[PDB]
């Protein structure tokens with residue numbers, strides 16, 4: 001399914017080139033500009049665990065998740081990944097635990113050593 005496909009066919013977007021965050025662009029967004037550090041970004045997403053189960057969705061809340069890019073307000077992979085996206089883009093990310101919640105996990109929902117899958121849509125970004 002999509003998680004396997006991004007695992008096997010995604011692009012490494014890490015600066016370290018350690019394959020910790022792999023990406024596929026599913027829908028190409030608008031123009032060439034990606035957000036800048038400190039921008040307010042508006043995103044819809046769905047996340048899955050490696051047990052095959054959905055663990056979260058902003059779509060199901062009927063409103064996007066909003067954060068300031070590049071400030072550690074989210075897991076490292078999200079800061080890295082959303083920074084590569086254009087407005088209107090939909091992407092898949094496959095994230096090893098070193099760029100997510102690590103050995104600690106995040107109780108109750110995220111186990112130790114969890115690889116995470118997201119479908120993410122960048123709705124908007126603003127200074």
Ligand SMILES: C=C[C@@H]1[C@H]2CCC[C@@H](C(=O)N3[C@H](C(=O)O)CC[C@@H]13)N2S(=O)(=O)c1cc(Cl)cc(Cl)c1
Nearest residue numbers: 045047055056065073074075078106107109110116
């Ligand atoms: C609103 C929740 C966000 C979502 C969406 C952005 C990525 C990631 C994350 O960086 N989060 C921040 C954090 O941990 O400081 C705040 C809480 C959490 N998660 S998440 O999808 O990985 C996530 C969802 C749930 Cl239900 C629970 C947890 Cl711990 C993480």
